[PDB]
A paper describes a structure:
TRIM5α is a restriction factor that intercepts the incoming capsids of diverse retroviruses, including HIV-1, and inhibits viral replication. Like all TRIM proteins, TRIM5α consists of an N-terminal tripartite or RBCC motif (RING, B-box 2, and coiled-coil domains), followed by a C-terminal domain. We therefore engineered artificial constructs – which we call miniTRIMs – that retain the integrated B-box/coiled-coil fold of the full-length dimer but are more amenable to biochemical and structural analyses.
A P212121 crystal contained two trimers in the asymmetric unit (3.26 Å resolution, R/Rfree = 0.26/0.30), a C2 form contained one dimer (2.1 Å, R/Rfree = 0.18/0.22), and a P1 form contained two dimers (2.3 Å, R/Rfree = 0.22/0.26). The dimer is quasi-equivalent to the trimer: the same sets of residues make the same interactions but with valence of two instead of three. The dimer buries a smaller surface area per subunit (450 Å2) compared to the trimer. Another distinction is that the first two turns of the coiled-coil helix are overwound and bent in the dimer form, which might indicate some structural communication between the interacting B-boxes and the coiled-coil domain. In context of the full-length protein, assembly cooperativity drives the B-box into the trimer form, and so the B-box dimer might represent an intermediate state that can incorporate an additional B-box domain to form the trimer.
Author numbering: 95 to 228
Write the structure that this text describes.
Amino acid sequence: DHCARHGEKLLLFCQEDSKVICWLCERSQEHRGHHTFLMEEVAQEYHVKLQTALEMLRQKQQEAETERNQVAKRVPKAPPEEKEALIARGKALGEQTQYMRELISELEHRLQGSMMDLLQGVDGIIKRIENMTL
Ligand SMILES: [Zn+2]
Ligand SMILES: [Zn+2]
């Protein structure tokens, strides 16, 4: 809640860095030309954004899981090469679903947490979700 560098209240949010900082950090060279906001002034848009993302991710996950199940179902009836291909396919899908599970987990954590929980490093996860949807 307080800055380790300056001891002041961590109440500001930097748009370029997506970092939560104090007013003395904003005056540091590392935040030169950056635009800062009180965390209250930006919590809403990111709440909405992450909320929107979470839905999509959940949908994509359930789809991927059903697909994995179907792939698994084809395995026993398939000949050896196709078997192995299907096994690999299943594994890959598993990896994807694990990734989606991680992101979803993080999103719920952020959406149910404090503003600092919500905003600290949100740009990375937004990037990740953006890549995932692409
Ligand atoms: Zn500071
Ligand atoms: Zn900055």
